[PDB]
Enzyme design. Structure first.
Site, PDB file in Angstrom:
ATOM      1  N   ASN A 192       0.828  -1.190   0.000  1.00 58.73           N
ATOM      2  CA  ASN A 192       0.000   0.000   0.000  1.00 58.73           C
ATOM      3  C   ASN A 192       0.868   1.247   0.000  1.00 58.73           C
ATOM      4  O   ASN A 192       2.012   1.232   0.458  1.00 58.73           O
ATOM      5  CB  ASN A 192      -0.941   0.009   1.213  1.00 58.73           C
ATOM      6  N   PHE A 248      -1.962   8.354   4.289  1.00 58.92           N
ATOM      7  CA  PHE A 248      -2.801   8.918   5.345  1.00 58.92           C
ATOM      8  C   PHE A 248      -4.011   9.652   4.762  1.00 58.92           C
ATOM      9  O   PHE A 248      -4.371  10.752   5.187  1.00 58.92           O
ATOM     10  CB  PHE A 248      -2.008   9.857   6.272  1.00 58.92           C
ATOM     11  N   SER A 283       4.477   4.830   9.735  1.00 61.12           N
ATOM     12  CA  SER A 283       3.999   4.721   8.365  1.00 61.12           C
ATOM     13  C   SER A 283       5.156   4.961   7.400  1.00 61.12           C
ATOM     14  O   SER A 283       5.942   5.894   7.595  1.00 61.12           O
ATOM     15  CB  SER A 283       2.879   5.726   8.092  1.00 61.12           C
ATOM     16  N   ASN A 342       4.694   5.585   4.042  1.00 56.67           N
ATOM     17  CA  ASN A 342       4.206   6.254   2.841  1.00 56.67           C
ATOM     18  C   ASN A 342       3.941   7.744   3.043  1.00 56.67           C
ATOM     19  O   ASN A 342       3.294   8.367   2.193  1.00 56.67           O
ATOM     20  CB  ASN A 342       2.937   5.553   2.341  1.00 56.67           C
ATOM     21  N   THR A 343       4.419   8.324   4.141  1.00 51.54           N
ATOM     22  CA  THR A 343       4.448   9.772   4.338  1.00 51.54           C
ATOM     23  C   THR A 343       5.896  10.177   4.589  1.00 51.54           C
ATOM     24  O   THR A 343       6.474   9.782   5.618  1.00 51.54           O
ATOM     25  CB  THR A 343       3.555  10.199   5.504  1.00 51.54           C
ATOM     26  N   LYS A 403       2.933   2.996  17.853  1.00 53.63           N
ATOM     27  CA  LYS A 403       3.139   1.964  16.846  1.00 53.63           C
ATOM     28  C   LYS A 403       4.473   2.199  16.149  1.00 53.63           C
ATOM     29  O   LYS A 403       4.742   3.298  15.650  1.00 53.63           O
ATOM     30  CB  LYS A 403       2.003   1.966  15.830  1.00 53.63           C
ATOM     31  N   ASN A 431       4.410  -2.155  12.275  1.00 47.48           N
ATOM     32  CA  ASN A 431       3.803  -1.534  11.104  1.00 47.48           C
ATOM     33  C   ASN A 431       4.315  -2.221   9.833  1.00 47.48           C
ATOM     34  O   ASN A 431       5.137  -3.137   9.876  1.00 47.48           O
ATOM     35  CB  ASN A 431       4.087  -0.028  11.071  1.00 47.48           C
TER      36      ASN A 431
HETATM   37  C1  FMN Z   1      -4.059  -0.369   3.013  1.00 47.00           C
HETATM   38  C2  FMN Z   1      -3.419  -0.245   4.365  1.00 47.00           C
HETATM   39  C3  FMN Z   1      -3.577   0.914   5.107  1.00 47.00           C
HETATM   40  C4  FMN Z   1      -2.977   1.025   6.348  1.00 47.00           C
HETATM   41  N1  FMN Z   1      -3.142   2.188   7.071  1.00 47.00           N
HETATM   42  C5  FMN Z   1      -2.562   2.306   8.307  1.00 47.00           C
HETATM   43  C6  FMN Z   1      -2.734   3.465   9.037  1.00 47.00           C
HETATM   44  O1  FMN Z   1      -3.413   4.389   8.585  1.00 47.00           O
HETATM   45  N2  FMN Z   1      -2.135   3.565  10.275  1.00 47.00           N
HETATM   46  C7  FMN Z   1      -1.379   2.508  10.756  1.00 47.00           C
HETATM   47  O2  FMN Z   1      -0.820   2.532  11.843  1.00 47.00           O
HETATM   48  N3  FMN Z   1      -1.213   1.374  10.021  1.00 47.00           N
HETATM   49  C8  FMN Z   1      -1.801   1.261   8.804  1.00 47.00           C
HETATM   50  N4  FMN Z   1      -1.617   0.103   8.098  1.00 47.00           N
HETATM   51  C9  FMN Z   1      -0.789  -1.009   8.683  1.00 47.00           C
HETATM   52  C10 FMN Z   1      -1.716  -2.059   9.311  1.00 47.00           C
HETATM   53  O3  FMN Z   1      -2.545  -1.356  10.216  1.00 47.00           O
HETATM   54  C11 FMN Z   1      -0.985  -3.194  10.013  1.00 47.00           C
HETATM   55  O4  FMN Z   1      -0.225  -2.620  11.039  1.00 47.00           O
HETATM   56  C12 FMN Z   1      -0.111  -3.937   9.010  1.00 47.00           C
HETATM   57  O5  FMN Z   1      -0.809  -3.942   7.773  1.00 47.00           O
HETATM   58  C13 FMN Z   1       0.248  -5.357   9.424  1.00 47.00           C
HETATM   59  O6  FMN Z   1      -0.921  -6.101   9.663  1.00 47.00           O
HETATM   60  P1  FMN Z   1      -1.316  -7.392   8.793  1.00 47.00           P
HETATM   61  O7  FMN Z   1      -0.084  -8.220   8.520  1.00 47.00           O
HETATM   62  O8  FMN Z   1      -2.327  -8.236   9.524  1.00 47.00           O
HETATM   63  O9  FMN Z   1      -1.921  -6.884   7.510  1.00 47.00           O
HETATM   64  C14 FMN Z   1      -2.216  -0.015   6.856  1.00 47.00           C
HETATM   65  C15 FMN Z   1      -2.062  -1.171   6.114  1.00 47.00           C
HETATM   66  C16 FMN Z   1      -2.656  -1.286   4.870  1.00 47.00           C
HETATM   67  C17 FMN Z   1      -2.475  -2.547   4.080  1.00 47.00           C
HETATM   68  O1  ORO Z   2      -1.950   5.452   5.768  1.00 44.30           O
HETATM   69  C1  ORO Z   2      -0.992   4.770   5.226  1.00 44.30           C
HETATM   70  O2  ORO Z   2      -0.696   4.949   4.034  1.00 44.30           O
HETATM   71  C2  ORO Z   2      -0.194   3.745   6.002  1.00 44.30           C
HETATM   72  C3  ORO Z   2       0.153   3.985   7.292  1.00 44.30           C
HETATM   73  C4  ORO Z   2       0.882   3.058   7.967  1.00 44.30           C
HETATM   74  O3  ORO Z   2       1.189   3.273   9.106  1.00 44.30           O
HETATM   75  N1  ORO Z   2       1.258   1.898   7.347  1.00 44.30           N
HETATM   76  C5  ORO Z   2       0.906   1.661   6.075  1.00 44.30           C
HETATM   77  O4  ORO Z   2       1.231   0.634   5.516  1.00 44.30           O
HETATM   78  N2  ORO Z   2       0.170   2.617   5.399  1.00 44.30           N
END
Ligand code: FMN
Ligand code: ORO
Ligand code: XBY
Length: 374
Positions: free
Chosen positions: A113, A117, A184, A186-187, A238, A267
């Site tokens: 991804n 944000f 994150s 991607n910022t 996180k 993350n």
């Molecule tokens: C599309 C997408 C958006 C995410 N957005 C956030 C976010 O806004 N804030 C955050 O802390 N993590 C974000 N994450 C990270 C997830 O919350 C999680 O920490 C990470 O994907 C690992 O979990 P998983 O292996 O079960 O997918 C995002 C992940 C994905 C795939």
């Molecule tokens: O909002 C996102 O783009 C994002 C945040 C984050 O913490 N981790 C991630 O994979 N995407």
């Protein structure tokens, strides 16, 4: 269960034919209109857990980024999750990077991804949470369910701390805990705030702003904390897995210095380069491939903090065994994301019973004992 069966059919078709973000939006639309299935079962008393004085009816919730804007809280929780982390939110709404920004790999149960944000901003998400909290009082399926809020900064913002304090003052009253997102990928430049010097400053400033809401309020605590705990929100942070091991140590004692209430590990990561279809793409990767790396990151931090900082587990949790691994490593609650994407409405129902059956086989009295036995 007949309900869950139908939604698995829709899931499979979605994963093959539809763009991932479009499916994700359908998910949330179905939730917004309350046509997803419910898990009305009593959760096993031996599977409950807690982060300090925060109680979880079961050890499974949804990670941040799934409901970035809190538009779908009721229906996600009613799937069988004990809690949800909304956000990450920012003070003002932002669009994020350009679509398509998310790509899934069914084969490897992995995702990549680069959203950036994207969210409606904190003023709007706050009114969304207020409405949920009103409904929560009316609904016996929502009582004792925990809602946390992930908070971050804007692409444009220079002062990381200026964004967080605004969010807290706006939405702190309605949150059970706050999660500081400095992980994150991607910022641009956000991870640089993880360096101990900058991080400690961030934590202390956050912890401070939470207390000032409590300090100056004419009304009782019962009407100040319009949340589940009726107390001030805890403070979690996180962290990203893309840190050398010395950087991890400097962070650990800062957490100890600040008396942080918990740590979310981990993350998304950029270290993965094996998956074919993500070779073209940019961004942070999550899913199965993130599992093994997340587990190790947990045991180290559990080590560096001498087991005094509660751990929330994230990254590559699909099975009840995947969960026990995270718990044995020192985690108390588990967060899910990719699992929901690849397993669907049944994710919580299924992973809860799997863990239940596993705890009995391994001879654990309850979940709390299995924490950190590795
Ligand atoms: C599309 C997408 C958006 C995410 N957005 C956030 C976010 O806004 N804030 C955050 O802390 N993590 C974000 N994450 C990270 C997830 O919350 C999680 O920490 C990470 O994907 C690992 O979990 P998983 O292996 O079960 O997918 C995002 C992940 C994905 C795939
Ligand atoms: O909002 C996102 O783009 C994002 C945040 C984050 O913490 N981790 C991630 O994979 N995407
Ligand atoms: C942010 C962000 C995340 C994403 C991507 C990674 N999410 C998804 O692919 C996703 N999320 C939830 C599901 C389960 C689902 C089940 C059923 C149905 C329906 F409605 F068809 F029955 C839709 C969805 C999926 C497949 N894209 O943007």
């Amino acid at each position: 269960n007949p309900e869950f069966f139908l939604y698995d059919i829709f899931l499979k078709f979605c994963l093959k034919y539809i763009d991932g973000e479009i499916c994700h939006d359908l998910f949330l639309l179905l939730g917004k209109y309350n046509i997803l299935p419910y898990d009305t079962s009593n959760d096993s008393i031996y599977a409950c857990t807690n982060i300090k004085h925060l109680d979880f009816i079961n050890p499974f919730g949804v990670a941040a980024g799934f409901d970035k804007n809190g538009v779908c809280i009721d229906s996600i929780l009613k799937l069988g999750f004990s809690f949800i982390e909304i956000g990450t939110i920012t003070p003002r709404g932002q669009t994020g990077n350009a679509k398509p920004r998310i790509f899934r790999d069914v084969e490897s149960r992995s995702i990549i991804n680069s959203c950036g944000f994207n969210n409606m901003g904190c003023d709007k998400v706050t009114e969304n949470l207020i409405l949920f909290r009103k409904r929560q009082e009316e609904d016996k399926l929502l009582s004792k369910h925990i809602v946390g809020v992930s908070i971050g900064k804007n692409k444009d913002t220079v002062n990381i701390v200026d964004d967080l304090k605004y969010c807290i003052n706006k939405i702190g009253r309605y949150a059970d805990y706050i999660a500081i997102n400095v992980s994150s990928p991607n910022t641009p430049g956000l991870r640089d705030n993880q360096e101990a010097g900058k991080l400690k400053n961030i934590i202390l400033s956050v912890k401070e702003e939470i207390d000032n809401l409590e300090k100056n309020n004419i009304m009782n605590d019962e009407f100040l904390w319009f949340n589940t705990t009726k107390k001030k929100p805890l403070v979690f942070v996180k962290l990203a897995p893309d840190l050398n091991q010395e950087q991890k140590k400097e962070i650990a004692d800062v957490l100890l210095e600040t008396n942080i209430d918990g740590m979310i590990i981990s993350n998304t990561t950029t270290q993965i380069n094996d998956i074919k279809s993500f070779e073209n793409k940019k961004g942070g990767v999550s899913g199965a491939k993130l599992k093994d790396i997340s587990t190790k990151f947990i045991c180290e931090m559990y080590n560096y903090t001498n087991k005094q900082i509660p751990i929330i587990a994230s990254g590559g949790i699909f099975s009840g065994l995947d969960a026990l691994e995270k718990i044995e490593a020192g985690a108390s609650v588990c967060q899910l994301y990719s699992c929901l994407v690849f397993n669907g409405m049944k994710s919580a129902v299924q992973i809860k019973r799997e863990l239940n059956h596993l705890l009995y086989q391994r001879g654990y009295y309850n979940l709390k004992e299995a924490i950190g036995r590795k």
